[PDB]
């Protein structure tokens, strides 16, 4: 027997194509470029000859293929963008055995305990320089595979060390005051507690909503207020906005206003409600997928590789034109960089270690009930890496992309794997140089860029950021914001209402009776650059007019004032765009005698207002408890144990235990092992065409090679 | 027949044949054409065409017939040319209205003999006329007019010429006026400093033993109120001198601290500067690849099988609810025109004319080869001259159309730049995206249409994009790339001597070679007419105040909105974290808010960002040029202020631009207001970017603001 062509093949996940006039099918997936005639004996896979025994059958206008197609062609090794990896990368994330066997080992200790959760299971990394020994002398790593285990037992955080090599539990440390994140479980249960609520209920009756079923509610953390906000700092507590379901797919457009439900997670039970003035319900269908819009014809456009990729991926690790890299997955803050080197005419030289983003801040404006605790910390809060979404081929991600699936750790410590996780890409990006030299034949050449695309969903809005290797040595760092707007009810249908001015006094009018709130989005990325080895210095370079002392006409000159940043707390800071900062290596040159460095910019670019810092008073809580917000350049000595920008366990934390701690001891950082965190990120001012849902909006971050390399760097190899 | 790979290759188009499926893909603009050896018929753009001779394999080689290109891509087939019966207003003039133009000044007494022309181009109806024939197919009632400005050997003369009747309507000799550089000038620098004993003389100094490998290079010498010793009244021009090596790249070998003052009237150097002795640069550094070899790549390929989704009539150019014109000038290159969104079957107002206005690229070394160096590109050599014919596949993506302009040669013959502007569509991510939990996934992807225009003046390769999003937004993106202008030294490393001396203004980027700190500094002129002709700038400044409201916050985020009443407020530094709108007060959005675009000068940039002129305020270069140091102007509309340098820049004594566009102050209260743009970038060069530099970009934006209800790519409503 065998099966319907087009149905199997869609299912598989491969673009379908039929050309009549040619008589030939055209198959796309991932790095296969596939051509199948019907009736032929043999078929092309990235420009390869590949023997059919079966094969494919036309009938009545319906195409067939045998039950073996699918895997014949797609994995018969003609497609070779992957390959088997011979010796494990150490950095390698745990498997799915390996986390059943962290999970086994902890259940196995006398302390679990039924209802233990797991906040986070990862790989606890080797040493740093066995990593490298590994990646550039392929040096074995000696240290047993670890993993760290965070346990949540009911409200309390436990810290775990697995021995997988021996199979052995090495530490289990109760970790004091700490809070966890909020895990799905969390989301269910306050819907559950909602609904089981008399009160609530009664709330939610006397602001025009008759059928209390038909509310959403959506939890968030509460933050910490020094008691002012009434909540006990040891209860592991969730406050609840609410929304109404009318139908349209989008409860994000009829919120409850002024209604916030506190819910205590080990009590299960609403412990207090706060409620201000009743705003009528915004009742208005306003779907956002489509479901009342004519869909418009646009002709087909692809981006295809014929003949394959330029780039390989054998087990984790992609190779591509100069640049080699790890890449791996992490619950908590997504994709991971590693061991990232760039062949420089036969040696491979370091550039970073360890990239990812640290973390991530969402702090709103408006004073109300519903909106003044309201600052999300997104990975850290929610785990970006599990609400990971799969990427919607062709649409997120080009057509020529590669999506890979990864597995993490569920919250109850079954394995999960995510579809489409990660895509990679390569693209055209105009000219990489050009001279067209008067009445001489022009030089031009084009410039490729591989992108590394990972897209996370925590709640309303979807954040998708993008790790782009520039072929000639720079690295670009892009994050875009996209989702709907978390709103606020209101009474004025227009400006020309009563209540326009107050309603509006925060945020702007989108629609009737719909508020955007101003906020922010404020993101911080950390990146372990070793330029070109581990010690590194920052040096500043300040472009200045200087009073011109040379005689001639002119009266100023354009000079730099360079300068070393020697510790910690003087790296702490703002980034003037006008300026230069690098990463430098003082122990080597280029063939001119400068510094190999990297040039650091924190702000290259972005599509919304920029934010210039944290938009909240210095006497905020909020913007004591995460400094990180403030400035968009930080420099800190390496510690493995170093890497959220706001925090290990930031949910209702009352100090700074992120990068104000990080750096608080003030450390040297002259010819010494630096992380360099970026924090970059917009001003929210919202307007009519972002709503029902938001065009998506990009914030730009660059590492350039300065005096990294000798000359042009993809002028090409030397022929003499 | 005809071989077909010859005939096809000769014609432009792109040839791939494919031995599984015995097919030839054969593409060229927006034609995506397939046909097979022996069918009689083929495939254009998704539509079956009928052959008379079907394409013959003979000897492993196809032959068409004497007629396949016509019949093919001449077939109707492809739908992205078509016809215009009704020319635009703003049409560029035509290769006979050029020669006629031409004709009908030298048949005036008052032409002389040698005379050239630095700019032949359309005077255009007035405004309010051009926006009726694009809105309502009103007929502009006037006979087609060109503006001919021609150069008697040093002086500026301005004339008009009525097209249609064959007549001169004016003649005016601009007094005080220096023309930009021609074409010719080149040549006769490099003539004269050729038959000059005297620099022979100071290049066998300099130790140059065969003079006749020194390569000229003309630039302007700006204006320093008599302190550099030149008169006012001359034709000068300034040459600084490189030695050719055989490496195809002068550049790389600087004669420092020897330049010449040529006047061009006389043919004569009239001053020759010389400072320390620096031996040559030698080592070639050739950048064309004559010494390297590329690795292998895999193909890409960018297709649209069916064709094309914008149409291009004449030059108006119609795409998704975009409709525009684009129109060339040989000074600043593209104009687009006439720019509207089609709201839901309504064709509004954005744009009625946007290009580039003028750009200036100052060095920051005291240096006698470089205090007087600032290059006014477009004003003083002409861009749209200089443009740079598009290499297809590479400065633009294989999907691309690329389009020929014609423009005026300074002889007055017509001139055809081919390949002089390319347009594309191209994926830019997603549009839009949303995956609620549990829920099926909601993505649209982004498309943008964009229009590239590349010109190159002397060593600067500069690439615009004029980027149309489909959701409303325009991106205007300048790069950079091409040769830096190096100063020779004799630091060979940082460890050596001199090194310090010689990086004083600039970093070491080979030995004995310094890339000289210098910014690059774009203004865009945008006649905006939001929806309308009548608006104002509005600011808004988001701004952190105490909380009054009660509760546990102590601030709030709020915005500060104020209007900009006159040209001198409107003329202001931007802060990237502030917006700035061109809001029509005469028209809302369903919710009540003014109808606006928000302007954003700097939305970004690969180089460090200047922030203003690096230069001090009593600067001569400063005090010629105010729009280097604002990053948003905004003036009344005046049909002759057009270029943020001033018409005649070159030696000009005072500010003759924007400095005097705004200097009354205007109301730009409820009325037609323009926008100039400022960004720029401020270079300290590094050894990545020499021999050739990797091109860098910079970033600026026009977005609707309240312009309309809601998102606006969700489609019509069923
Ligand atoms: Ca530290
Ligand atoms: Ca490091
Ligand atoms: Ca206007
Ligand atoms: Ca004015
Ligand atoms: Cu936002
Ligand atoms: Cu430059």
Same mark, same amino acid.
């Given at each position: 027997?065998?099966?319907?062509?087009?149905? &199997?093949?869609?299912?598989?996940?491969?673009?379908?194509?039929?050309?009549?006039?040619?008589?030939?099918?055209?198959?796309?997936?991932?790095?296969?470029?596939?051509?199948?005639?019907?009736?032929?004996?043999?078929?092309?896979?990235?420009?390869?000859?590949?023997?059919?025994?079966?094969?494919?059958?036309?009938?009545? =206008?319906?195409?067939?293929?045998?039950?073996?197609?699918?895997?014949?062609?797609?994995?018969?090794?003609?497609?070779?963008?992957?390959?088997?990896?011979?010796?494990?990368? @150490?950095?390698?994330?745990?498997?799915?055995?390996?986390?059943?066997?962290?999970?086994?080992?902890?259940?196995?200790?006398?302390?679990?305990?039924?209802?233990?959760?797991?906040?986070?299971?990862?790989?606890?990394?080797?040493?740093?320089?066995?990593?490298?020994?590994?990646?550039?002398?392929?040096?074995?790593?000696?240290?047993?595979?670890?993993?760290?285990?965070?346990? !949540?037992?009911?409200?309390?955080?436990?810290?775990?060390?697995?021995?997988?090599?021996?199979? $052995?539990?090495?530490?289990?440390? @109760?970790?004091?005051?700490?809070?966890?994140?909020?895990? %799905?479980?969390?989301?269910?249960?306050?819907?559950?507690?909602?609904?089981?609520?008399?009160?609530?209920?009664?709330?939610?009756?006397?602001?025009?909503?008759?059928?209390?079923?038909?509310?959403?509610?959506?939890?968030?953390?509460?933050?910490?207020?020094?008691?002012?906000?009434?909540? $006990?700092?040891?209860?592991?507590?969730?406050?609840?906005?609410?929304?109404?379901?009318?139908?349209?797919? =989008?409860?994000?457009?009829?919120?409850?206003?002024?209604?916030?439900?506190?819910?205590?997670?080990?009590?299960?039970?609403?412990?207090?409600?706060?409620?201000?003035?009743?705003?009528?319900?915004?009742?208005?269908?306003?779907?956002?997928?489509?479901?009342?819009?004519?869909?418009?014809?646009?002709?087909?456009?692809?981006?295809?590789?014929?003949?394959?990729?330029?780039?390989?991926?054998?087990?984790?690790?992609?190779?591509?034109?100069?640049?080699?890299?790890?890449?791996?997955?992490?619950?908590?803050?997504?994709?991971?960089?590693?061991?990232?080197?760039?062949?420089?005419?036969?040696?491979?030289?370091?550039?970073?270690?360890?990239?990812?983003?640290?973390?991530?801040?969402?702090?709103?404006?408006?004073?109300?009930?519903?909106?003044?605790?309201?600052?999300? !910390?997104?990975?850290?809060?929610?785990?970006?890496?599990?609400?990971?979404?799969?990427?919607?081929?062709?649409?997120?991600?080009?057509?020529?992309?590669?999506?890979?699936?990864?597995?993490?750790?569920?919250?109850?410590?079954?394995?999960?794997?995510?579809?489409?996780?990660?895509?990679?890409?390569?693209?055209?990006?105009?000219?990489?140089?050009?001279?067209?030299?008067? *009445?001489?034949?022009?030089?031009?050449?084009?410039?490729?860029?591989?992108?590394?695309?990972?897209?996370?969903?925590?709640?309303?809005?979807?954040?998708?950021?993008?790790?782009?290797?520039?072929?000639?040595?720079?690295?670009?760092?892009?994050?875009?914001?996209?989702?709907?707007?978390?709103?606020?009810?209101?009474?004025? $249908?227009?400006?020309?209402?009563?209540?326009? $001015?107050?309603?509006?006094?925060?945020?702007?009018?989108?629609?009737?009776?719909?508020?955007?709130?101003?906020?922010?989005?404020?993101?911080?990325?950390?990146?372990?650059?070793?330029?070109?080895?581990?010690?590194?210095?920052?040096?500043?370079?300040?472009?200045?007019?200087?009073?011109?002392?040379?005689?001639?006409?002119?009266?100023?000159?354009?000079?730099?004032?360079?300068?070393?940043? *020697?510790?910690?707390?003087?790296?702490?800071?703002?980034?003037?765009?006008? &300026?230069?900062?690098?990463?430098?290596?003082?122990?080597?040159?280029?063939?001119?005698?400068?510094?190999?460095?990297?040039?650091?910019?924190?702000?290259?670019?972005?599509?919304?207002?920029?934010?210039?810092?944290?938009?909240?008073?210095?006497?905020?809580?909020?913007?004591?408890? !995460?400094?990180?917000?403030?400035?968009?350049?930080?420099?800190?000595?390496?510690?493995?144990?170093?890497?959220?920008?706001?925090?290990?366990?930031?949910?209702?934390?009352?100090?700074?235990?992120?990068?104000?701690?990080?750096?608080?001891?003030?450390?040297? %950082?002259?010819?010494?092992?630096?992380?360099?965190?970026?924090?970059?990120?917009?001003?929210?001012?919202?307007?009519?065409?972002?709503?029902?849902?938001?065009?998506?909006?990009?914030?730009?971050?660059? !590492?350039?090679?300065?005096?990294?390399?000798?000359?042009?760097?993809?002028?090409?190899?030397?022929?003499?």
């Amino acid at each position: 027997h065998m099966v319907p062509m087009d149905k &199997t093949l869609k299912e598989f996940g491969a673009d379908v194509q039929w050309d009549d006039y040619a008589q030939l099918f055209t198959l796309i997936k991932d790095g296969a470029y596939v051509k199948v005639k019907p009736g032929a004996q043999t078929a092309i896979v990235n420009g390869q000859p590949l023997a059919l025994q079966v094969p494919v059958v036309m009938k009545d =206008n319906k195409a067939w293929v045998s039950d073996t197609f699918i895997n014949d062609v797609f994995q018969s090794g003609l497609d070779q963008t992957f390959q088997v990896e011979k010796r494990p990368h @150490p950095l390698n994330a745990l498997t799915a055995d390996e986390i059943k066997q962290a999970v086994e080992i902890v259940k196995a200790s006398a302390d679990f305990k039924p209802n233990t959760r797991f906040t986070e299971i990862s790989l606890l990394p080797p040493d740093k320089e066995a990593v490298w020994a590994f990646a550039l002398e392929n040096k074995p790593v000696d240290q047993p595979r670890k993993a760290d285990v965070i346990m !949540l037992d009911g409200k309390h955080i436990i810290e775990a060390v697995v021995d997988l090599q021996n199979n $052995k539990l090495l530490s289990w440390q @109760p970790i004091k005051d700490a809070h966890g994140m909020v895990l %799905l479980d969390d989301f269910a249960s306050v819907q559950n507690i909602i609904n089981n609520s008399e009160e609530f209920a009664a709330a939610v009756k006397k602001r025009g909503i008759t059928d209390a079923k038909k509310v959403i509610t959506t939890p968030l953390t509460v933050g910490y207020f020094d008691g002012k906000d009434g909540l $006990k700092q040891d209860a592991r507590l969730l406050k609840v906005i609410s929304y109404l379901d009318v139908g349209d797919g =989008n409860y994000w457009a009829h919120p409850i206003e002024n209604l916030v439900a506190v819910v205590d997670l080990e009590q299960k039970k609403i412990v207090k409600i706060e409620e201000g003035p009743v705003v009528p319900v915004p009742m208005t269908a306003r779907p956002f997928d489509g479901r009342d819009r004519v869909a418009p014809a646009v002709k087909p456009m692809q981006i295809i590789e014929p003949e394959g990729k330029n780039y390989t991926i054998t087990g984790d690790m992609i190779h591509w034109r100069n640049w080699d890299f790890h890449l791996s997955m992490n619950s908590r803050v997504g994709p991971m960089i590693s061991t990232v080197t760039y062949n420089d005419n036969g040696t491979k030289r370091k550039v970073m270690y360890e990239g990812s983003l640290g973390g991530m801040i969402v702090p709103y404006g408006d004073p109300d009930i519903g909106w003044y605790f309201k600052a999300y !910390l997104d990975s850290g809060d929610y785990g970006m890496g599990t609400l990971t979404s799969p990427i919607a081929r062709g649409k997120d991600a080009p057509s020529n992309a590669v999506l890979l699936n990864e597995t993490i750790a569920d919250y109850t410590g079954v394995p999960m794997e995510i579809p489409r996780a990660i895509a990679v890409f390569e693209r055209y990006a105009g000219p990489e140089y050009k001279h067209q030299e008067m *009445g001489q034949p022009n030089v031009s050449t084009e410039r490729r860029e591989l992108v590394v695309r990972w897209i996370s969903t925590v709640g309303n809005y979807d954040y998708i950021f993008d790790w782009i290797f520039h072929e000639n040595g720079t690295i670009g760092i892009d994050a875009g914001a996209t989702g709907i707007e978390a709103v606020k009810g209101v009474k004025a $249908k227009t400006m020309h209402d009563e209540t326009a $001015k107050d309603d509006t006094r925060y945020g702007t009018l989108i629609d009737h009776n719909i508020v955007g709130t101003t906020h922010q989005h404020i993101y911080n990325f950390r990146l372990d650059l070793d330029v070109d080895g581990e010690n590194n210095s920052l040096v500043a370079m300040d472009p200045v007019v200087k009073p011109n002392t040379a005689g001639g006409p002119r009266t100023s000159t354009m000079q730099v004032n360079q300068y070393n940043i *020697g510790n910690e707390q003087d790296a702490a800071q703002k980034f003037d765009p006008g &300026t230069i900062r690098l990463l430098s290596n003082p122990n080597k040159e280029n063939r001119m005698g400068n510094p190999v460095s990297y040039q650091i910019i924190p702000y290259a670019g972005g599509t919304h207002p920029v934010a210039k810092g944290a938009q909240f008073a210095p006497d905020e809580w909020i913007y004591h408890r !995460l400094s990180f917000m403030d400035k968009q350049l930080w420099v800190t000595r390496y510690h493995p144990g170093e890497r959220f920008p706001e925090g290990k366990y930031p949910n209702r934390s009352t100090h700074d235990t992120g990068l104000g701690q990080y750096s608080k001891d003030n450390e040297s %950082l002259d010819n010494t092992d630096a992380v360099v965190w970026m924090t970059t990120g917009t001003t929210h001012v919202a307007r009519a065409e972002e709503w029902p849902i938001m065009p998506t909006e990009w914030v730009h971050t660059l !590492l350039k090679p300065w005096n990294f390399f000798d000359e042009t760097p993809t002028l090409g190899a030397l022929k003499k």
